Amino acid sequence: ATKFPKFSQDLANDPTTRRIFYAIATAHDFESHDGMTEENLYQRIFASHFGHLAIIFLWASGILFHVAWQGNFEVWIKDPVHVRPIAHAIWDAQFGPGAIKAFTQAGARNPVDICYSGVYHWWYTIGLRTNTELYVGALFLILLAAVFLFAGWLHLQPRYRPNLGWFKNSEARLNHHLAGLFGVSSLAWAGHLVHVAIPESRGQHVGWDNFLSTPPHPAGLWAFFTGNWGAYAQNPDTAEHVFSTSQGAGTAILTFLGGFHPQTQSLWLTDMAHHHLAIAVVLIIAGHMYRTNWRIGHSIKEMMDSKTFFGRKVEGPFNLPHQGLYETVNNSLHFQLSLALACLGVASSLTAQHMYSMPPYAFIAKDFTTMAALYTHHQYIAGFLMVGAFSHAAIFWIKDYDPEQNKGNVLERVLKHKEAIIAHLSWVSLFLGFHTLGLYVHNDVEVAFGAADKQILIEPVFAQFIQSANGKILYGFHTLLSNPDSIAFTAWPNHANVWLPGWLDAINNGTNSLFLTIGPGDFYVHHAIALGLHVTTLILVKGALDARGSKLMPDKKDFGYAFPCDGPGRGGTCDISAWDASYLAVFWMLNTLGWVTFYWHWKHLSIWQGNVAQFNESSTYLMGWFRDYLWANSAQLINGYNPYGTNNLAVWAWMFLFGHLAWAVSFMFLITWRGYWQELIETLAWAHEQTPLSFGYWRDKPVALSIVQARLVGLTHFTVGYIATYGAFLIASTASKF
Amino acid sequence: NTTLVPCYKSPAFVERMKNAPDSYYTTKPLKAYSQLLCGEDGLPRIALDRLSLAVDVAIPIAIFLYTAGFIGWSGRSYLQAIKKQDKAEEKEVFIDVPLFISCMVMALFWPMAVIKELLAGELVAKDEEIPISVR
């Protein structure tokens, strides 16, 4: 009869230790709390986004404060290739003298951490030059995080809480999020690049006391309104300009050479100021599509139910019944959440796939570890955000879908044939594993039995055609931007490919990651990646589509999202729920991104070490993946502390072994199940009651923690031990053997 | 078109034929790999060209996919044979080999036997006769 949890009274009268843990993992599910209406629902979503934005702005103010105070941003900015950044300082009061000395690195007078985040390269590019502009940017983000904690407190006061009609204003939110949140704030970033970041990359110092007087262009403020727009791209930075100096600079602010800066191997700052200006014009235009109260625009409710196409009688958009989908998306907060995680786990993969090939930051191509730790970061974020895009698909079907309102539309038609999508995701999965594993352990046996020439090596000639259709002249397909006598190369009616001669210098230089050389070792991993993306879609689609029920239990909606089972009847129904299929696909998300980021790392660890013929001859069989990548590159990692000493990788040699322990302890929660431990806690609770001098007594009775909890407790350790081990191998096998 | 030179004039494949053993595995199967395209490390790749490897890639398709649908059609026509005899529960464990061979030689001409059931509409079962779930 306790007070905690106050949100659900069926859990506050729990007499066991399940009350503490189930009040943690239910505290943010606002839709299941006792005594909550729909208007009070949205006003706590809204005021906890404010308390979440303040965490982001206080986290970003701890990056800035700790490199202004403890970092070497003044020292690093003078030789950004031959000195390492500093994250923060070490105060671990149990170091020995061998770890004070080993961690006093990068020219510090104290133990420090080498920053592998790449925020030094970000602030060098956008025009931050001193430790004071970092400090007053950290004090501003503290105050910016205070106006978001105050706004969240404001919008729970009863005179300022919005009503349900304001939260369900979907057309007015799309107008301001495209024009104002995405359009103006990309127009404003082109304002920072033109005013501050481009002139500070050319030597002159533009600050708050300086930007209102010196215009960013000699033809300033006038060539925009007349129509002389070509003035802004007249003389650009030439190919002997060195960064943050005046020697070789130009005066163009919006030019479109394309390709890379020849000194930083990064995109031109004039190319990105032009870029966010073209994004802003296109997005502010797109924000004037839907109707607010000014009578013009589109009504999304009309676009669903429109059944007339210039006199014809189509069933809707693309002759498909989309009626009733406006009130399906708008009322479901899980349909809107799953579409927002699917669109954020694509933008997080697209971050990773582009920032290594087209680096935007100064000298981040020549920092091999921050380039490697930022690919693997954004691909594991994008794998988590895509498992959660299908986790809330399953919560949408259970909690937020009704077949009567969605009658005959495009959402009933998927459930009408859902055993044909799962039967075909399970064929592509079965195809791509019988011929990707079978083609490795054919190549494994052939190299093992002497005859390496008997390997089946499929040259990936369809993605070698993509590079040859973009400018890579290495293969010799000689078509379509590899053929300079073509229609796409010249663009015969206008000849306005001003981006093209700078792009082809970038794709045909063999020193960048832009469209790397693709061989038969890359054919094979893309079918492991395709096997990975198809099975973890199969587990998540079967979790979403069988969330209503199947023949093993036709009332899965009545039991909720996360229930253990339905007993040992009907054969046994372990892991039957839609939670437990959004759960087996975290083992496949982590596995697939242990194939993506194992292949990103080994393809790049062969280019950075020069041994390109190491990956190209021994990635076609699974021994070279094990001998030449895992066993070979962990030599310098596990020697972070030998019996004879200790170096700067002594914390990555420890986290690598902390992550094997966290992985192995996960298996206790995954192999052993609950009733082994309930008969053992029943025995240790006997020996506590019958012993003298033990004056404690449990307020709430010790039970073995529940079935769907230890799946989560054993997936948390599997994930943390997957990330502490690979985020200490990728850091220490790159920051030692560069 | 690509850099996949044939293994005749590839300067890294002739060393695999220079120092090699003899027995049966590195002499006659190595001079038969000479007409194969191989990269800059002397390993015979499998590329897809228009006409020079049109039927050179279509023999592993047509030879396999015939005896992929020869195992599948003799297994389908056996399960349909024992269900018209109304004894399919016990004929699947104890394989009636006079019938399974009779349903094997009926599957030797299966590409001209599948399309006799596609146009007759008897290959697929119709959607209102197949067990499904609550959907």
């Binding site: 055609f465 259709a469 397909f477 078509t479 073509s486 | 078109n1 060209d49 228009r50």
Partner: peptide, 29 residues
């Protein structure tokens, strides 16, 4: 029925597959 809208979108995507495969075998330029 004769499928008129499922075809001419499947063989429209198959048409775009055949223009890309025309450049791939260097048929057209």
């Amino acid at each position: 029925p004769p499928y008129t809208f499922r075809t001419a979108w499947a063989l429209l995507l198959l048409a775009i597959n055949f223009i890309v495969a025309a450049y791939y075998f260097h048929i057209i330029e």
